[PDB]
Write a protein that binds this ligand. Structure first.
Ligand SMILES: *CCC(=O)Nc1ccccc1CN(C(=O)Nc1cccc(C(F)(F)F)c1)C1CCN([C@H](C)CCC)CC1
Length: 363
């Protein structure tokens, strides 16, 4: 019934694939801009603070125990229910039904895209552009839409949607996908089409004018939600560039300082910091190799952890996730003379020992 096989008669490009590019697709439960558990293409699961509650809602909707992770096809099924609801709303709207009824399937997808972005009232404000669309005055409709605040807010997305109205084709999405495929091919592993290998990661860094050991490279990995440091998949690359709204190295270069600025929010730095452990640790290995931990600590805690030099000296004379995570809490709370350290605070033994190690130096 919700089987995607029921849609095999349609085109392979569709509204799901359109919004995957324009809004983005997440296959793991995350919190939206508010606090709320969400998955797929913007599918709200619950307003409950409980992740188990979100997981329960998700399992009911998918029909299996997902533990908070779904496939792209499952995301499409969720999305199709959302689209059907949106379309019913459009058909209830006296300002939108006539133009929707008049449009071909591709242009309907562009209208639905608008409704997902700005809602019915937003789209219904475009009275003259909607009338031009209903009259099939495509070029005038496109000109008028480009004059709007919408165009200023999300120019890349808005241009693609307007092109879809102007042409009744998927050209804007085809062109973007090809542009990214051609860029990806500059970095892909000659021995594995779906990976960027050691030469490719080096080339990517070179093209960005970045040292592979710089914190900037780790920040990009974070934004690309890369799973692991010694692999870089096609899916990660494509999904990352798409999310960042970059179709070239020039554009990605321009985003990097904006990524760095994001880390000024303590919440975002904590996410980055915890990410780093997961990214750094060899898959399978139970904890993070001490030397690797030191290397990454020196990158991410320089200028945040007042005792980083002593921390190096201490460790030079395997790190579990809990210990890694808690060092940032320690760094943040500890006074410059360590006088506020609470040895009954259930810090890792490593940190208890460090505080003992470090007090000749503070004396
Ligand atoms: C793991 C094998 C390896 O070194 N591969 C490699 C080759 C060339 C350049 C970098 C790397 C691995 N690193 C890395 O960040 N990889 C990465 C994976 C996925 C996505 C990205 C992206 F998007 F480009 F940012 C990058 C780096 C790992 C760690 N080293 C040093 C030790 C860091 C100093 C703390 C740097 C290279």
């Amino acid at each position: 019934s919700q089987d995607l096989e029921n849609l095999y008669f349609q085109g392979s490009m569709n509204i799901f694939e359109m919004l995957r590019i324009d809004e983005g697709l997440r296959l793991k439960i995350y919190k939206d801009t508010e606090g709320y558990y969400t998955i797929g293409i913007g599918h709200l699961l619950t307003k409950s603070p409980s992740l188990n509650a979100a997981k329960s809602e998700l399992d009911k909707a998918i029909g299996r125990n997902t533990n908070g992770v779904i496939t792209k096809d499952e995301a499409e099924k969720l999305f199709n229910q959302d689209v059907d609801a949106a379309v019913r709303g459009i058909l209830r709207n006296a300002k939108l039904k006539p133009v929707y009824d008049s449009l071909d399937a591709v242009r309907r997808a562009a209208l639905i895209n608008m409704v997902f972005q700005m809602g019915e009232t937003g789209v219904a404000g475009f009275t003259n552009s909607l009338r031009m669309l209903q009259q099939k005055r495509w070029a005038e409709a496109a000109v008028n839409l480009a004059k709007s605040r919408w165009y200023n807010q999300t120019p890349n997305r808005t241009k693609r949607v307007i092109t879809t109205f102007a042409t009744g084709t998927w050209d804007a999405y085809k062109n973007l996908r090809k542009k990214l495929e051609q860029l990806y091919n500059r970095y892909k592993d000659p021995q594995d089409e779906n990976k960027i290998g050691i030469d490719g990661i080096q080339q990517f860094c070179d093209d960005l004018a970045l040292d592979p050991a710089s914190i900037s490279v780790l920040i990009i990995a974070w934004k690309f939600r890369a799973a692991t440091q010694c692999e870089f998949s096609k899916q990660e690359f494509m999904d990352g560039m798409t999310e960042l709204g970059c179709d070239s190295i020039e554009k990605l270069k321009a985003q990097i300082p904006k990524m760095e600025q994001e880390l000024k929010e303590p919440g975002r730095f904590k996410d980055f910091y915890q990410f780093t452990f997961n990214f750094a640790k060899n898959p399978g290995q139970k904890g993070l190799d001490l030397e690797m931990a030191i290397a990454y600590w020196n990158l991410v805690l320089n200028g945040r952890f007042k005792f980083l030099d002593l921390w190096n000296k201490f460790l030079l004379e395997s790190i579990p996730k809990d210990t890694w995570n808690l060092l940032l809490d320690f760094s943040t709370m500890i006074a410059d003379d360590m006088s506020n350290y609470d040895e009954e605070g259930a810090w890792p033994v490593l940190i208890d020992d460090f505080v003992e190690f470090a007090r000749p130096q503070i004396a």
